[PDB]
Coordinates of C-alpha atoms in Angstrom, one line a residue:
Chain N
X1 CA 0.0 0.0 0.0
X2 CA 1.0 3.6 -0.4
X3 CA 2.4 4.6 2.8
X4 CA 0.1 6.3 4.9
X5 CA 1.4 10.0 5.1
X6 CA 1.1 10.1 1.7
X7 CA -2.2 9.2 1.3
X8 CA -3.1 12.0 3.8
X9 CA -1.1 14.1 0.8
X10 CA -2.7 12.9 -1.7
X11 CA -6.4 13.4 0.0
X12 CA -6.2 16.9 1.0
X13 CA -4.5 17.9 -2.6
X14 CA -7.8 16.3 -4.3
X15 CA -10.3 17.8 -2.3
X16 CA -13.1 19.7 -4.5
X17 CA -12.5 23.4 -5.0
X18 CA -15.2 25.9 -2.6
X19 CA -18.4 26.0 -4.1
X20 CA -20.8 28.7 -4.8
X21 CA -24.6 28.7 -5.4
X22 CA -30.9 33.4 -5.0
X23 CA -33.5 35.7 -2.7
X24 CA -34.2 34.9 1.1
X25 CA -37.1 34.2 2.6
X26 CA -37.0 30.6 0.5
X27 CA -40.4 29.5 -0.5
X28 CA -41.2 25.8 -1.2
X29 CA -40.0 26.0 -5.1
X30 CA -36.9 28.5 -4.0
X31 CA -36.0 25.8 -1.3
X32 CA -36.0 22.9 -4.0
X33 CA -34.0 25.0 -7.0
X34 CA -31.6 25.0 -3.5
X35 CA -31.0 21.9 -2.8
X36 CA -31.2 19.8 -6.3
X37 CA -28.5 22.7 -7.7
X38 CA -26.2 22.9 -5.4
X39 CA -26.7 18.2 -5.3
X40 CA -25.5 18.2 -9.0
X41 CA -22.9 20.8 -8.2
X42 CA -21.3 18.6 -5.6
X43 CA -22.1 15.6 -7.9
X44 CA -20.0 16.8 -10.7
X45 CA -17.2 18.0 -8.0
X46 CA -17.6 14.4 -6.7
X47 CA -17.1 12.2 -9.8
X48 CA -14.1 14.8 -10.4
X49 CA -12.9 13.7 -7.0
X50 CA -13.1 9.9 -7.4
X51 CA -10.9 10.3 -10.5
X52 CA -8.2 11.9 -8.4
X53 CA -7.9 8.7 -6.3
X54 CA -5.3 6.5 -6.6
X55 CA -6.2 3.4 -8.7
X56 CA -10.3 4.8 -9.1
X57 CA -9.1 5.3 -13.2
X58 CA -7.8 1.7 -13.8
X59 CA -11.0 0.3 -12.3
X60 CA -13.7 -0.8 -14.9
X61 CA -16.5 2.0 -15.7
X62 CA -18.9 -0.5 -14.5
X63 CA -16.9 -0.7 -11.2
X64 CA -16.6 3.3 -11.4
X65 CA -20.3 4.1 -11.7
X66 CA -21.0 1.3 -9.3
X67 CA -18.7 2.8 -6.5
X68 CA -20.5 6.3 -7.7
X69 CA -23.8 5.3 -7.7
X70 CA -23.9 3.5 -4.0
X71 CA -22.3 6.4 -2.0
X72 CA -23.0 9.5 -3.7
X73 CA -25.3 10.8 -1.6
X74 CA -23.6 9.5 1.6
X75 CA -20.6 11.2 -0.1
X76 CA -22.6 14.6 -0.2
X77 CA -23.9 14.1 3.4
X78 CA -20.3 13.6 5.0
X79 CA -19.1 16.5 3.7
X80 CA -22.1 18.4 4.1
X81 CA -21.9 17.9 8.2
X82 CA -18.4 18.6 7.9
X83 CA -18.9 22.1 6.4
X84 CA -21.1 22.6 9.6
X85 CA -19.1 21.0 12.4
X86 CA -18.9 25.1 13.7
X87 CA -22.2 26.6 13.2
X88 CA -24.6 24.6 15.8
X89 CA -28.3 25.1 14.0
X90 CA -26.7 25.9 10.4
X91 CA -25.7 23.9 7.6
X92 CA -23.4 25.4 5.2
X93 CA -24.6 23.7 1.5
X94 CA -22.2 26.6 -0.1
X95 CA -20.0 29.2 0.8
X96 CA -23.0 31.6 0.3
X97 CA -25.8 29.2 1.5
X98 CA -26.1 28.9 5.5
X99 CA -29.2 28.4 6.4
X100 CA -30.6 28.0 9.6
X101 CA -32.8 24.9 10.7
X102 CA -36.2 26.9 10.4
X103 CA -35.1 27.9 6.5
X104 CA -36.5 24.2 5.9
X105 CA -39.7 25.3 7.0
X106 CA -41.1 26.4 3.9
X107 CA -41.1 22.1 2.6
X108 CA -43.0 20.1 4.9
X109 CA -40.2 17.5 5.7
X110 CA -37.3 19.3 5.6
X111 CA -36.7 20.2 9.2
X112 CA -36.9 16.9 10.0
X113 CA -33.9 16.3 7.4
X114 CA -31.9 19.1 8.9
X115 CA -31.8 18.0 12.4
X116 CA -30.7 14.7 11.7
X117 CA -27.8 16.4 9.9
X118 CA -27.0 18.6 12.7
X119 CA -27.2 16.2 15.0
X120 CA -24.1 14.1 13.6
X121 CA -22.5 17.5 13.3
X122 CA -22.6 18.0 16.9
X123 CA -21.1 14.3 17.4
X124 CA -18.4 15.6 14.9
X125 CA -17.8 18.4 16.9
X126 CA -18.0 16.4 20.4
X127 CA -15.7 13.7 19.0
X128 CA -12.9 16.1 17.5
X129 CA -13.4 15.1 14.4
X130 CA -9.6 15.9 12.8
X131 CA -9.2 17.2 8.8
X132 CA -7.2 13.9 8.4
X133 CA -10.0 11.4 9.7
X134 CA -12.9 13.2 7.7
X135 CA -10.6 13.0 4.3
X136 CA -10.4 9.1 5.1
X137 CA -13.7 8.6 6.0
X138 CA -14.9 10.2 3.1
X139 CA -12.8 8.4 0.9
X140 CA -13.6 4.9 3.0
X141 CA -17.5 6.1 2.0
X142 CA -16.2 5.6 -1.5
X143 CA -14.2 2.7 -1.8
X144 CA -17.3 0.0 -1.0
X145 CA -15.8 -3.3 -2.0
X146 CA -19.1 -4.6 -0.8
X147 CA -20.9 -2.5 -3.4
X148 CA -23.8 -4.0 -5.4
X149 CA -26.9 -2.8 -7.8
X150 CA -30.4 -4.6 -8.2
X151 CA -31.1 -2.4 -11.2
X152 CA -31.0 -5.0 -13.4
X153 CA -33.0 -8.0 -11.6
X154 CA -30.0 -9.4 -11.0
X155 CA -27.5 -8.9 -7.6
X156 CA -24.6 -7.4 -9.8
X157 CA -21.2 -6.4 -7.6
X158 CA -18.5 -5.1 -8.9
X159 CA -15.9 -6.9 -11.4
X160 CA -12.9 -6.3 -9.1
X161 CA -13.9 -6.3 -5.5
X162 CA -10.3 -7.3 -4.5
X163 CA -8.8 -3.9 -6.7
X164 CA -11.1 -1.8 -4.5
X165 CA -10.4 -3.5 -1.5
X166 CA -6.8 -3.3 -1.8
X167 CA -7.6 1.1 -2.2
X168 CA -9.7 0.2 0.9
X169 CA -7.3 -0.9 2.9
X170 CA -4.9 1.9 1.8
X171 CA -7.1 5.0 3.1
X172 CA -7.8 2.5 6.4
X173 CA -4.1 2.1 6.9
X174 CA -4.0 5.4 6.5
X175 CA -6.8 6.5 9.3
X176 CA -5.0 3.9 11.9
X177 CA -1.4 5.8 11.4
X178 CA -3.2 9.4 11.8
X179 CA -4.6 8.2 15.1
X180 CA -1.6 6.6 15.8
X181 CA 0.0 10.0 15.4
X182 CA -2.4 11.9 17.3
X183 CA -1.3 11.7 21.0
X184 CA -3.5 8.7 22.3
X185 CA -2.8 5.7 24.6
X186 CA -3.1 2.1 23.1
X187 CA -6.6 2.0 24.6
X188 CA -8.0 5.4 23.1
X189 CA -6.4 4.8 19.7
X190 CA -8.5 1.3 19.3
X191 CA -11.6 3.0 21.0
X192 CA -11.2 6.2 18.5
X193 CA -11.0 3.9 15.6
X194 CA -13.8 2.0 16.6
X195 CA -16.0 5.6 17.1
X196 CA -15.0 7.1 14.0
X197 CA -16.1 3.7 12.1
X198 CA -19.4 3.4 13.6
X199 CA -20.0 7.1 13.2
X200 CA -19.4 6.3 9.3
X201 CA -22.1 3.7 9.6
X202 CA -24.3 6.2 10.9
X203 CA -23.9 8.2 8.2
X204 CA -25.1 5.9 5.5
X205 CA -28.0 5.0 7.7
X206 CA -28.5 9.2 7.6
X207 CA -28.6 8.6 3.6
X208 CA -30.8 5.7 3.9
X209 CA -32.9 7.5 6.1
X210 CA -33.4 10.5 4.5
X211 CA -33.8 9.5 1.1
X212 CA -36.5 7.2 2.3
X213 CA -38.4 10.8 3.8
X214 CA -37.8 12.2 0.9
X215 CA -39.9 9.4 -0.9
X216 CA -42.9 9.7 1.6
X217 CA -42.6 13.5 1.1
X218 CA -43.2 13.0 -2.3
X219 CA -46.1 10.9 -1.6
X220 CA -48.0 13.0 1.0
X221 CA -47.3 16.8 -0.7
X222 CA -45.9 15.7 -4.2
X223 CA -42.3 17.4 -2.8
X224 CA -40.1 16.7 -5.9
X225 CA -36.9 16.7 -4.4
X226 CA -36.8 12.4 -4.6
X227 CA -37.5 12.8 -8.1
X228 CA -34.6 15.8 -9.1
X229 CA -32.3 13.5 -7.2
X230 CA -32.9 10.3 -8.8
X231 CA -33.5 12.6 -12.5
X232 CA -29.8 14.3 -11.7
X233 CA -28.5 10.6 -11.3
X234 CA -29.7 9.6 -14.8
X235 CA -28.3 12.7 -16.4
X236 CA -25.0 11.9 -15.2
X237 CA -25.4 7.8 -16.6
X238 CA -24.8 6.6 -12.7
Chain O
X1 CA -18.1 -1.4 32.5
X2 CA -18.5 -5.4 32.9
X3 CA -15.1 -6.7 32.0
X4 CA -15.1 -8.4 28.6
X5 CA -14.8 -12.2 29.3
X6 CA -17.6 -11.0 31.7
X7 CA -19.4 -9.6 29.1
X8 CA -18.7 -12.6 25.9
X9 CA -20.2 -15.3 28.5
X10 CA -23.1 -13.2 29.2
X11 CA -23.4 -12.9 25.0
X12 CA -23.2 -16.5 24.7
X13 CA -25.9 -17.2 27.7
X14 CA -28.4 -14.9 26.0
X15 CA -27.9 -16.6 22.4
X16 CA -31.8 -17.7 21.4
X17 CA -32.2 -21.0 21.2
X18 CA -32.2 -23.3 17.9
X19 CA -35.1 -22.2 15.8
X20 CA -37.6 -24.6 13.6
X21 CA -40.3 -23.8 11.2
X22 CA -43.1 -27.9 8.0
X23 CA -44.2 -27.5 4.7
X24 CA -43.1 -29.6 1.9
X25 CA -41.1 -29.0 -1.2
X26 CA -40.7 -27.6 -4.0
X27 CA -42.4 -24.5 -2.6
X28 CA -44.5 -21.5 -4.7
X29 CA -44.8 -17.9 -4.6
X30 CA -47.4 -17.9 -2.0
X31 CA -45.6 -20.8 0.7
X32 CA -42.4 -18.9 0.6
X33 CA -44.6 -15.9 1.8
X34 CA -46.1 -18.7 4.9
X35 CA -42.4 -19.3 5.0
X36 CA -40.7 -16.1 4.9
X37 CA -43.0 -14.5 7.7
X38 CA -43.6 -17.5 10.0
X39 CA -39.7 -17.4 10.1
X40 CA -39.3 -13.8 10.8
X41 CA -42.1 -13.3 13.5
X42 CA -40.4 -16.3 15.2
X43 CA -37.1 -14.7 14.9
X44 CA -38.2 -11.7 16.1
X45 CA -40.0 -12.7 18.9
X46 CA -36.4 -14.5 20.1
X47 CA -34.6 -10.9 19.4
X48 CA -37.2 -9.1 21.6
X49 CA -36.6 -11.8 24.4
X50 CA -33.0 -11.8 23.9
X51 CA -32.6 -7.5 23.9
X52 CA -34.4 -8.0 27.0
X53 CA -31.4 -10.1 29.0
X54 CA -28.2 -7.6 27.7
X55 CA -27.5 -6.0 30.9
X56 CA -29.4 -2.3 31.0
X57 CA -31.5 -2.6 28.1
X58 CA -34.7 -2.9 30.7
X59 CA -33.7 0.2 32.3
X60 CA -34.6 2.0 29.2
X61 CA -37.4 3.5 28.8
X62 CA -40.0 1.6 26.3
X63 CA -39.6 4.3 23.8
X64 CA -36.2 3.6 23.7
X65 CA -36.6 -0.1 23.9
X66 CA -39.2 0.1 21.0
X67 CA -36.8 2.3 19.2
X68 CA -33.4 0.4 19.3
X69 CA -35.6 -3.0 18.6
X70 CA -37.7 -1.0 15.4
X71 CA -34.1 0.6 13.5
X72 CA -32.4 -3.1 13.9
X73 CA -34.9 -5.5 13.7
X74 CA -33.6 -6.6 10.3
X75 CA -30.0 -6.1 10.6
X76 CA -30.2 -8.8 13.5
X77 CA -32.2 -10.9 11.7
X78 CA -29.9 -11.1 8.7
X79 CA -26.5 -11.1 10.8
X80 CA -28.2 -14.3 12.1
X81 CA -29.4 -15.9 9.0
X82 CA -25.6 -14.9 7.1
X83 CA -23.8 -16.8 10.5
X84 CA -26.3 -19.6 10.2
X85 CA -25.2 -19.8 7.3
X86 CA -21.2 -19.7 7.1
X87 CA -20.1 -23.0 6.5
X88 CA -22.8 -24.0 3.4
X89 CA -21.9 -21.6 0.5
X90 CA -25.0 -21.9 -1.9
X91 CA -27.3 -22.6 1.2
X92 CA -29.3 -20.4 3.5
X93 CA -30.2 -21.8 6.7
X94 CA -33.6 -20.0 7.6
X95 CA -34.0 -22.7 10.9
X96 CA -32.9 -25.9 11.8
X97 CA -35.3 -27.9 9.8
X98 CA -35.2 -24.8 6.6
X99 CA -32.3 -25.1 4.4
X100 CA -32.7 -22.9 1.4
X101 CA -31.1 -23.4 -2.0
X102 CA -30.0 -20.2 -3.5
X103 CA -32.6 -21.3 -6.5
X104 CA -35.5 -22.1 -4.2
X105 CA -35.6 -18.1 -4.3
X106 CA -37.0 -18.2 -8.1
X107 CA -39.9 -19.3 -6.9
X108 CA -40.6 -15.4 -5.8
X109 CA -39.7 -12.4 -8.3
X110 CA -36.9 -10.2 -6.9
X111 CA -36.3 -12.6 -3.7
X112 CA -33.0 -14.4 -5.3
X113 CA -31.1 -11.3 -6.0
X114 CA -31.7 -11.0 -2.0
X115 CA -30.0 -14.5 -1.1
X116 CA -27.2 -13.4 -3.8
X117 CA -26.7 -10.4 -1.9
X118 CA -26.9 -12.4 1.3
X119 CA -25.3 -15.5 -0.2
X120 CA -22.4 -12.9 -0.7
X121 CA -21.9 -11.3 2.7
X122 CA -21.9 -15.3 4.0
X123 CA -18.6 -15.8 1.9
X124 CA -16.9 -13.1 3.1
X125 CA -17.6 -14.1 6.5
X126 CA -16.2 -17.2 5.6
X127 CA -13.0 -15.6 4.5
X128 CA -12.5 -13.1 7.3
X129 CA -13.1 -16.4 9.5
X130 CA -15.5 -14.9 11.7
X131 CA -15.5 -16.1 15.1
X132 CA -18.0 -16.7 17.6
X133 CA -17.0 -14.4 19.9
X134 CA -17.4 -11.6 17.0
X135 CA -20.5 -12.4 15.8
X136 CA -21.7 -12.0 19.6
X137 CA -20.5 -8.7 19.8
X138 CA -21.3 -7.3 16.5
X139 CA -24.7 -8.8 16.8
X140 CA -25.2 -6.4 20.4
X141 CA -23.3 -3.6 18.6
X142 CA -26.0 -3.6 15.6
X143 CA -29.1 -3.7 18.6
X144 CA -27.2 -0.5 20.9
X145 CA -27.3 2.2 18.2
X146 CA -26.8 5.1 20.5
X147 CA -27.5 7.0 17.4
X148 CA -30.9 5.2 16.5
X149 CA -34.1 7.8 15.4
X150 CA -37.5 8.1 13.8
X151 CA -39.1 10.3 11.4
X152 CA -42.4 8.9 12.5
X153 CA -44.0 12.1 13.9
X154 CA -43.2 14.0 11.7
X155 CA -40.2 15.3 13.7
X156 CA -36.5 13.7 14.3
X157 CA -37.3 11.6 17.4
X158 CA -33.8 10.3 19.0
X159 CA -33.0 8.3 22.2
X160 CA -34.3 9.3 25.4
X161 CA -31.1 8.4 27.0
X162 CA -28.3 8.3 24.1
X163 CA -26.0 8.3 27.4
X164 CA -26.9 4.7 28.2
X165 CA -27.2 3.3 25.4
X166 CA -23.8 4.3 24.4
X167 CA -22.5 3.1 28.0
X168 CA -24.1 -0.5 26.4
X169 CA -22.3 0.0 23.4
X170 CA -18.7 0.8 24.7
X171 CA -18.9 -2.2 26.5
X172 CA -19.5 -4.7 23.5
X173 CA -17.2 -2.7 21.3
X174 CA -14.8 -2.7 24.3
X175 CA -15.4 -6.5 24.4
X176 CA -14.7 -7.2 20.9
X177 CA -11.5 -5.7 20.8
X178 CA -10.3 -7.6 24.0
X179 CA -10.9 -10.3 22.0
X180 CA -9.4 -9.6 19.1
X181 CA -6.4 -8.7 20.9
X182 CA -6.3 -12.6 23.0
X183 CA -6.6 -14.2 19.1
X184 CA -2.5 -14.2 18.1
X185 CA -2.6 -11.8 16.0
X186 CA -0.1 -9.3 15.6
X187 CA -1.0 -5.4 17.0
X188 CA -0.9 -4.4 13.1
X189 CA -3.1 -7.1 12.5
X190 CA -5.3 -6.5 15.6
X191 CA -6.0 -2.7 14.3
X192 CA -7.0 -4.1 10.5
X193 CA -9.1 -7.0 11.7
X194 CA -11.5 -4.3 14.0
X195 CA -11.5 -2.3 11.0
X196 CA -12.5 -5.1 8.8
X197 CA -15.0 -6.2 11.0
X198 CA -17.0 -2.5 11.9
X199 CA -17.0 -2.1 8.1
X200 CA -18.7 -5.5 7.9
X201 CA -21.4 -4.5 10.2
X202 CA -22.0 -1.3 7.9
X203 CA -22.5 -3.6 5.1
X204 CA -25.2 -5.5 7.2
X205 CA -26.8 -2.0 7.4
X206 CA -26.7 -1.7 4.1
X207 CA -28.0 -4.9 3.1
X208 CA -30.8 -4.3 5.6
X209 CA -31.7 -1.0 3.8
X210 CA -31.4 -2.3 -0.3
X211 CA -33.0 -5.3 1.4
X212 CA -36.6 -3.8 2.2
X213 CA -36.1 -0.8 -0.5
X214 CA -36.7 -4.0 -2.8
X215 CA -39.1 -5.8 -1.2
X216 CA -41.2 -2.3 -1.0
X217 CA -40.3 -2.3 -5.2
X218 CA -41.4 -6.0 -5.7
X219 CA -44.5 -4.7 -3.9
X220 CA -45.1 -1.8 -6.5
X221 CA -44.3 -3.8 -9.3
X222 CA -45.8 -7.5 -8.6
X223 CA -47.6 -7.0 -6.2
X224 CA -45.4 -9.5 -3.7
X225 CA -47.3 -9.2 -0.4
X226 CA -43.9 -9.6 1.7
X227 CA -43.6 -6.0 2.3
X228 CA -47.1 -5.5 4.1
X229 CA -46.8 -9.0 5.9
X230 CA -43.3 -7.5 7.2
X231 CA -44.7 -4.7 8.3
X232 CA -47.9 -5.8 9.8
X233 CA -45.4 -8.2 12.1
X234 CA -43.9 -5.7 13.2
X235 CA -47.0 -3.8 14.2
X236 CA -48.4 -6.8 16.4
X237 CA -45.0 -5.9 18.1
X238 CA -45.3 -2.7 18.8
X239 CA -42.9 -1.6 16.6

């Protein structure tokens, strides 16, 4: 594997550039041209991101799209709480979109949404989340070896599990050196590690979650947001 | 916390028992149905009884009792049915007496592309070599989610007490890695295998959530009652 400090390197120097998005108070139709723009903004800066990864090019496309497709919105939800680890009650979508919780008032749904995305920001903040564990969490979010599609009828996984395991276990390595490095006992280090792991499970179950609220707003006030998602993921072939 | 060889014998005393169903073969769409359900109420009756003897799970309150049991009911049930399952690649060990073939799932439309996905997750256990002492603990790790909530009022509803529930949690997790680190292996070795096996529980998570996000599509699309008959267990539990 590439060495660990490295990797750390190599993570930061791909990060996305800042993005940038619009007339406050947001109404219901203001809120959604919100939230799907600024989704296939950070979609594009995501795919642009994979690329960037060591080995992510010399995968298949199948195996590309497929590692896409699972986490992209579990990709967009990490580093949407990250953004806000500072601002308890706001979430910074862009550099000049902060809104507070109660902006989500104007959907029926969306506060809801927000507070479970604050409330993992708060954990970020109460567990000291570091630059260096969110850049390999993020990537870990990514590099799903276990990553499968039913969209054909068939259970399909990808053609190289073992490629993107061996890219797994890189950015892994990579998070057990930082915390290594990081001025904890033997103990805390193995507790840490265990934290910051469960807190990324957490996260998909935030993208399962939500997603699935988003289908039942859809149902009960014909919110379109589901839809723009799952429209945006076509336009992009994921 | 209760030290950790405390803690693995109190795991292994609170295993269910063995589970049975007997209806004969080769079976249609509608007794895989009988099947599925008679097999999941039963489990879930014995994960409801077994929550019930972890040490502090009954000084909960009932809402957070009813919500740890409601955001992992499945993710229990299939960490079970993949260990069941570990040593039979192909096979699917629903109970004793209910061996599945991975074909048997033809017999409903969208239901094999489930045991695939579970018929997967089974190898892989294999190959990590799973132990019983880590199924134990990640089994208790998927029930205390000190970060379990519901959207069901309309407002994000989270644990009474996240406090306790993360007391319970720290002492499975602390658990497993005592035992990790009395299995030989090396302290590099140590720090990869709890990695390798939190990740696994994530991709039970997963598989519970493309699990039912199918079974909800094979209700839209044919109709396949196992959906509602799910969800209507899970109502005459209160949950």
């Amino acid at each position: 594997h590439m060495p660990p400090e490295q990797v750390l390197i190599l993570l930061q120097g791909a990060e996305p550039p800042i993005l940038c998005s619009l007339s406050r108070p947001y109404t219901e139709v203001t809120m959604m041209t919100l939230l799907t723009s600024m989704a296939d903004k950070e979609l594009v800066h995501m795919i642009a991101w994979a690329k960037k990864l060591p080995g992510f090019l010399q995968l298949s496309l199948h195996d590309q799209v497929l590692l896409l497709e699972s986490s992209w919105l579990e990709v967009l939800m990490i580093g949407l709480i990250w953004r806000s680890i500072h601002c308890p009650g706001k979430l910074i979508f862009a550099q000049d979109l902060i809104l507070d919780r109660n902006e989500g008032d104007c959907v029926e749904g969306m506060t809801e949404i927000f507070d479970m995305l604050l409330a993992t920001a708060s954990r970020f903040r109460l567990l000291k989340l570091k630059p260096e564990e969110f850049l390999c969490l993020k990537a870990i979010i990514l590099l799903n070896s276990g990553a499968f599609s039913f969209c054909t009828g068939t259970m399909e996984p990808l053609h190289d599990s073992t490629a993107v395991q061996n890219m797994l276990d890189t950015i892994t390595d990579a998070l057990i050196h930082h915390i290594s490095q990081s001025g904890y006992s033997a103990q805390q280090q193995a507790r840490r590690q265990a934290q910051l792991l469960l807190l990324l499970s957490h996260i998909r179950h935030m993208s399962n979650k939500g997603m699935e609220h988003l289908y039942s707003m859809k149902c009960k006030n014909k919110v379109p947001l589901y839809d723009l998602l799952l429209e945006m993921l076509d336009a992009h072939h994921l």
